[PDB]
Design an enzyme around this catalytic site. Structure first.
Site, short mmCIF file in Angstrom:
data_model
loop_
_atom_site.label_atom_id
_atom_site.label_comp_id
_atom_site.label_asym_id
_atom_site.label_seq_id
_atom_site.Cartn_x
_atom_site.Cartn_y
_atom_site.Cartn_z
N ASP A 129 0.80 -1.22 0.00
CA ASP A 129 0.00 0.00 0.00
C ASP A 129 0.84 1.27 0.00
O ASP A 129 0.28 2.35 -0.19
CB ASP A 129 -0.94 0.01 1.21
O1 LIG Z 1 1.78 -2.58 2.75
C1 LIG Z 1 1.26 -3.80 3.25
C2 LIG Z 1 -0.05 -3.58 3.97
O2 LIG Z 1 -0.23 -2.16 4.09
C3 LIG Z 1 -1.38 -1.75 4.84
O3 LIG Z 1 -1.57 -0.34 4.74
C4 LIG Z 1 -1.01 0.46 5.78
C5 LIG Z 1 0.49 0.63 5.54
O4 LIG Z 1 1.19 -0.52 5.98
C6 LIG Z 1 1.05 1.86 6.25
O5 LIG Z 1 2.38 2.10 5.82
C7 LIG Z 1 0.19 3.07 5.95
O6 LIG Z 1 0.74 4.19 6.57
O7 LIG Z 1 -1.10 2.83 6.42
C8 LIG Z 1 -1.77 1.79 5.70
C9 LIG Z 1 -3.17 1.69 6.27
O8 LIG Z 1 -4.05 2.61 5.64
C10 LIG Z 1 -2.65 -2.38 4.28
O9 LIG Z 1 -3.72 -2.14 5.20
C11 LIG Z 1 -2.50 -3.88 4.03
O10 LIG Z 1 -3.64 -4.36 3.33
C12 LIG Z 1 -1.25 -4.16 3.23
O11 LIG Z 1 -1.07 -5.56 3.05
#
Ligand SMILES: OC[C@H]1O[C@@H](O[C@H]2[C@H](O)[C@@H](O)[C@H](O)O[C@@H]2CO)[C@H](O)[C@@H](O)[C@@H]1O
Ligand SMILES: OC[C@H]1O[C@@H](O[C@H]2[C@H](O)[C@@H](O)[C@H](O)O[C@@H]2CO)[C@H](O)[C@@H](O)[C@@H]1O
Lengths: 809, 809
Positions: free
Chosen positions: A482
């Site tokens: 993400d």
């Molecule tokens: O990237 C893997 C994982 O990411 C998740 O989103 C998070 C992210 O890890 C974080 O860096 C960001 O600041 O916030 C988001 C949440 O909105 C995501 O939820 C997962 O589905 C994904 O596998």
């Protein structure tokens, strides 16, 4: 270490209260949920941590984890707590047992022992706390017991922001030994909360400033310091609930109490017993349900049976007790808890969110499908009902409303494929093809409804139709990662990296999505063949082959697979890049798709992964870490090196490397990767890991971080499901398949063998695997009920009996 | 009492730290703002408590008000705080002086005295803290001084909700005696914060868990307990700033230190001194600006002179010292602070909001127009620029962006009239009619721009074009009373009472808006006559007369004025109603409009107000209070009786009742109403009032509440402006008007006289009022410069001289 595993009781026993972080457990199965730490901190809610929070909790507090279910023992001026918090006076003995759906906390001081069992009973809208007070001294004692909880105003965001109104809204009722919290019950809420005890009380308190005092903390409330209750009635400000009981204990004599935190919903017509008096009939029934210790014990035993039945579908007997306790107890427990809790409330998720990821909802199903098949089928249909007509999905799914978040939107181009993967997993587990013929709406619109197989078709051709210049899928807003935002180009601090796009999204490609497409297209083609659509299966296979050729021509860097192309059309994850020369996601999903198996490309990529991404604590996402902000990459470079997506250890994507290592037939490497992140194998470095040693966390600090080895965001992640799949299906080789149970282990050579008891499609298989010639992979013989069979697919019996299976490698 | 007024220094002196609630003060004038309590709790921000918060603060904490600028004196194992918090060890002496833009806190323990002056200097983006340490004992001492602040992650909502990301983002640099907080500076942010001291330090700390300890509180940080800094560098989690200095003090010797909390913004091209090193040039300049005590003293004197010039335009000399201190110091100070702070941050407003009310800005202008006329003119033009084309207004104005809140919207039908009232007040104060000819956009759209007078015309004819069945104005979503929602009819919790409307809004009318229309249409007609539009003035007067007849025919209940009609067309505020038979708003605004002066209706309504709404602590909004939820009324009945809009004392409309009492010529009643809510007159019941005894609060618990007399939501309200207008213009009779300054006092009969020095339109008037015959109202003679004049309007001189005026009643 700070404790030990008790495998016979399926508990983790914490022996010192000062853990590196508060270590928590979850209570509740259907609607009432509790988070409880090892010092009894935390809070409870009804179905919604954001909109129906019952008790107040402060995140990121000083001191940490203040606020919870607090019992105070007052003994002739001295006072203390069984969980050592909040008072923090030294105890003769302390113990916390975190079990399955329950927590026990025992503390002793000055010859007085207090043991509290917290759990949410089945089909019950309340948390039950059983308290035993025992006089282990030689003299008769006179003590006072104080209970304490702090209420929330039902809306956590409003509770923590809107004081200008809500300091004047708090209301309580006090009757007998029950304190009822009924804020806003007079206008629009038909629900209230209560705190009860099953004994006559000496006093009560419901005003926070009376029980505690304005300038006092939880560690020394003025009522506890003075040894008696103030009998205060709350009026605005902060409603609380506190009983006080005066107890005389002879030497060797013990007393038992049941405290209940209950939630009641009334019909709008039956809201009042009289003018201004709430109707308490349901609360009376709830309290009488557990007014004796015997009833509490019956409910506790029933909860134990429920969890034992949940865990009994996959049972491993091997020489490794850590592996046994991970596979048999803790991984499956965490998968079930993750299904029950989504991503709502932890000690890192603050409970103000509206839902979980669509892809995360699909991925958890792979973990829990063998335990709750019917609920998995219902969840699959609910997820498919939110899909758009073009085949795209809402990024955020809300299990409470069974709808997608329109504010967040779509354009995360890996999301639709996860639905196909989860549906295939469900079918392979159950053999139930009828789910394909169910009528599922699009965008929750019954007028435009089609078959579930049509939903999968739209998911497949969403990738087919959104191809980029090289023939690889367009990444869109992002993919599984993400924080890889190649269409954002944000310069303003406050805008979201995931929903802000300043590019048309017609150039940036993802080879991770390409690997996912190749890997899941096999299942799609199989389902096409089941439906009798030969031309459709041929066309899908043509698209899969084209994607495979595109990956070979434009997705391979020379010794590993590329990661992406950006909006400039430049390689991401290439040796020509200064930083981020190699990523981890593409390698795992491309090798799992069997690309590069014959020419040695997959082996070269896995060797590169070992060379550049391996650490003693797991595999980092990419190497080298980004040391500055890259506007063309999005959120990934905004983290400091070694944290989160900037070269942290994301244990979710380590499982894909484990599976890929099993693909090339290297079981020692796969198990070595598995052990580096399995909680039971790092319990001995708990002080470095710093989080719970019995559940997976989302993220471990990478080699570029100064806190290398430290975890964040525990208990609520897709790591549990994917790691259970990697260990139980790819390494141990017990794989559900369309025609039945496939046996194809890939194990360390030094293993002599093991056995797995697997419940599958109405029958039990006791599969004993032996390794007389110490190989890693390759089945020489399979015998079922004494007769040799051909192939590696076990017959389906569906007879409720046990069948012996004998496997020679 | 918990202190006393020091009028010569213009301070309030708090002598005991265990004050009924934390009593706060504001620092800063333009961009950098600080909230500081009497124990040095609170926090700072740069222009925006929501998006640029510098230090962390926890609202509704246990214990209250933990977190701030904390100094720890460590003396041979013992340690303490000069503000008595957070350590809470008893002090030999404690004192807190809250001044104008500054706060002094002095504490003494074991012969060591610590005095800290906190203030924000003019044209400076930082809070300066001057610390004197004095050895008042007989022996040489060796001590360690610790400073402490806790940083916020610049976004308070994100800081308190998004731990899953922001536990990995915190970053600092440490250089010399300065700790720089630079979270997300490697990223889209171009600003950082710093904490400095102008002396060589013995140690530092920037990690919260190192300085404090995970299970310790602010009251006993482990580094302070050990008497030594840990020199920790923050890495994620919680960044903090702490210096430690080792000091040897001879008997009678003192040391001086300057601590600065500073904010720096850099240009994007000048962000870095080198790779990974922030550019510190502006911080170096800022720190050198105040590196000696002499420079701090110069800045302090400049701030004192600035605040003295702000309060010098209205000076009262009477026999009443409480009245003198209210009029000369504290009311005007609160009005200026309310202009500087809007409604963003208090100890009841959490700083997460987006703006203030449109009507609230217009009403505050009346309070502060005599102090800052040019800024008032600019604010008036900015408010008018957000007006919609049809004459309606956005309910919430955002002074940071100078735009209206589109999400909240419009349809609060009293809002446009406040713009006319504020513009008329500005013109009466300054005599500057040119503001009427300025080109002002509509909806912030320069293409559709017209004169300011045209904006006033649209505001006037919104009411004319939105009349109801009885000819009274349609109320819409609400009027001044935001909790009277007659078009809502809400049964579902967690939906706004103000923006949810289930009715078309074509039936419910407001008598309060009708009274406002009659009262402000006189000013509109005068402005029509100024522009030479005789026919327009005639037509406006016709509409005003029609409204007056409508009020007389349908807005009078027989003994008092009605409040409203609901969507059913039923009277609100009638003797026929069982609860809420009389409201307060209609009486005040209808008598102020002079509707029933000749027939005795106004006097009858004021007698009814005295009979039914009067309490020793002020006047309640309505009587009787609502004892159940009324779906047809909205939010008003959702409160418990005696709180907020359900029969609480709203000091904002008590001022309107005071003005109405002056209208009927009853000065004793007007002053008796004024004294019941004026802070200086309830300092003696400070324990009951419980909030700051030197500023107005929004709300005091009414006679139906068990906490009758207790205040909520202090320091940020329109009460200050309207009460200053009531006392200084209606009672004391110094009223700005077109063509000059009008003298028309209405005072208690027993007064012998008084004197007011008024700066007005470039000249000073020393007006001595004498009451030889002891009447309440009626001017017998006015003499200017020794010559008797005719009428009650003083000539305008605009010569920068002082003119003596004698008034005989
Ligand atoms: O990237 C893997 C994982 O990411 C998740 O989103 C998070 C992210 O890890 C974080 O860096 C960001 O600041 O916030 C988001 C949440 O909105 C995501 O939820 C997962 O589905 C994904 O596998
Ligand atoms: O009603 C007078 C006053 O109300 C203010 O609105 C408050 C209201 O007091 C409170 O009851 C409600 O819960 O919240 C709103 C804030 O949204 C309003 O801000 C003032 O302009 C108005 O004079």
């Amino acid at each position: 270490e700070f404790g030990f595993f008790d495998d016979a009781n399926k508990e983790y026993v914490i022996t010192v209260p000062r853990t590196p972080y508060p270590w928590i457990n979850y209570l509740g199965t259907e609607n009432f949920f509790s988070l409880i730490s090892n010092t009894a901190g935390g809070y409870c809610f009804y179905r919604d941590a954001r909109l129906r929070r019952i008790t107040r909790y402060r995140y990121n507090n000083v001191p940490i984890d203040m606020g919870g279910r607090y019992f105070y023992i007052y003994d002739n001026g001295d006072f203390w707590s069984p969980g050592w918090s909040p008072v923090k006076r030294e105890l003769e003995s302390y113990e916390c047992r975190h079990g399955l759906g329950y927590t026990k906390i025992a503390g002793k001081r000055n010859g007085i022992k207090a043991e509290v069992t917290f759990f949410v009973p089945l089909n019950y809208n309340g948390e039950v706390q059983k308290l035993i007070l025992k006089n282990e001294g030689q003299d008769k004692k006179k003590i006072t017991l104080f209970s304490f909880i702090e209420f929330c105003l039902w809306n956590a965001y409003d509770d923590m922001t809107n004081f200008q109104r809500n300091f004047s809204t708090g209301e309580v009722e006090i009757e007998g030994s029950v304190i009822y919290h009924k804020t806003e019950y007079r206008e629009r809420r038909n629900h209230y909360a209560f705190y009860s005890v099953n004994a006559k009380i000496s006093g009560f308190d419901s005003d926070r400033d009376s029980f505690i005092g304005l300038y006092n903390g939880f560690d020394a409330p003025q009522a506890v310091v003075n040894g008696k209750s103030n009998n205060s009635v709350a009026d605005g400000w902060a409603p609380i609930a506190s009983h006080s009981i005066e107890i005389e204990l002879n030497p060797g004599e013990q007393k038992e109490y049941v405290f209940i935190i209950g939630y009641v919903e009334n019909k709008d017509e039956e809201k009042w017993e009289s003018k201004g008096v709430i109707n308490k009939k349901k609360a009376y029934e709830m309290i009488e349900q557990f007014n004796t210790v015997e009833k509490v014990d019956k409910a506790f035993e029933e909860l134990k049976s429920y969890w034992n039945a949940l865990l009994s579908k996959y049972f491993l007997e091997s020489h490794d007790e850590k592996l046994n306790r991970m596979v048999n107890i803790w991984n499956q427990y965490q998968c079930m808890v993750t299904f029950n809790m989504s991503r709502s409330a932890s000690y890192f998720e603050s409970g103000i969110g509206r839902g979980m990821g669509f892809r995360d909802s699909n991925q958890d199903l792979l973990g829990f499908v063998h335990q709750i098949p019917e609920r998995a089928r219902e969840r699959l249909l609910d997820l498919a009902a939110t899909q758009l007509e073009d085949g795209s999905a809402y990024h955020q799914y809300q299990p409470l409303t069974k709808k997608g978040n329109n504010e967040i939107g779509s354009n995360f181009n890996d999301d639709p494929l996860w639905l196909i993967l989860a549906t295939a997993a469900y079918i392979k587990e159950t053999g139930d093809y009828s789910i394909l013929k169910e009528q599922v709406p699009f965008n929750n619109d019954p007028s435009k409804a089609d078959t579930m197989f049509e939903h999968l078709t739209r998911s497949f051709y969403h990738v087919v139709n959104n191809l980029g210049p090289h023939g690889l899928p367009l990444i869109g807003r992002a993919d599984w990662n993400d924080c890889l935002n190649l269409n954002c180009f944000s310069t303003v601090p406050d805008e979201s990296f995931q929903t802000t796009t300043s590019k048309d999204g017609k150039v940036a490609e993802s080879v991770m999505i390409a690997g996912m497409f190749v890997f899941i297209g096999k299942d799609y083609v199989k389902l096409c063949e089941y439906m009798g659509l030969e031309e459709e299966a041929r066309k899908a296979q043509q698209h899969i082959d084209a994607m495979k050729e595109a990956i070979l021509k434009y997705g391979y860097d020379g010794e590993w697979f590329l990661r992406a192309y950006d909006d400039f059309g430049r390689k991401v994850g290439s040796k020509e890049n200064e930083e981020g020369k190699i990523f981890i996601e593409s390698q795992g999903f491309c090798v799992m798709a069997e690309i590069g198996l014959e020419d040695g490309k997959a082996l070269k990529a896995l060797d590169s992964v070992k060379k550049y991404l391996d650490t003693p604590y797991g595999l980092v996402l990419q190497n080298p870490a980004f040391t500055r902000y890259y506007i063309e990459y999005g959120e990934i470079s905004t983290y400091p090196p070694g944290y989160k997506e900037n070269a942290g250890i994301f244990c979710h994507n380590n499982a894909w490397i484990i599976c890929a290592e099993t693909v090339v037939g290297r079981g020692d490497m796969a198990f070595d990767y598995y052990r580096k992140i399995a909680p039971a194998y790092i319990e001995d470095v708990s002080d470095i890991h710093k989080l719970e040693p019995y559940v997976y966390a989302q993220m471990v600090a990478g080699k570029d971080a100064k806190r290398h080895g430290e975890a964040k965001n525990s208990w609520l992640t897709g790591t549990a499901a994917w790691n259970f799949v990697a260990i139980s299906q790819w390494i141990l080789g017990v794989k559900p398949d369309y025609d039945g149970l496939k046996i194809d282990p890939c194990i360390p050579k030094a293993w002599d063998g093991y056995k797995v008891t697997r419940y599958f499609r109405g029958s039990t298989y006791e599969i004993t695997v032996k390794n007389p010639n110490h190989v890693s992979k390759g089945v020489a013989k399979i015998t079922v009920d004494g007769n040799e069979i051909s192939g590696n697919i076990l017959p389906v019996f569906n007879d409720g009996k046990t069948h012996k299976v004998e496997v020679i490698l």
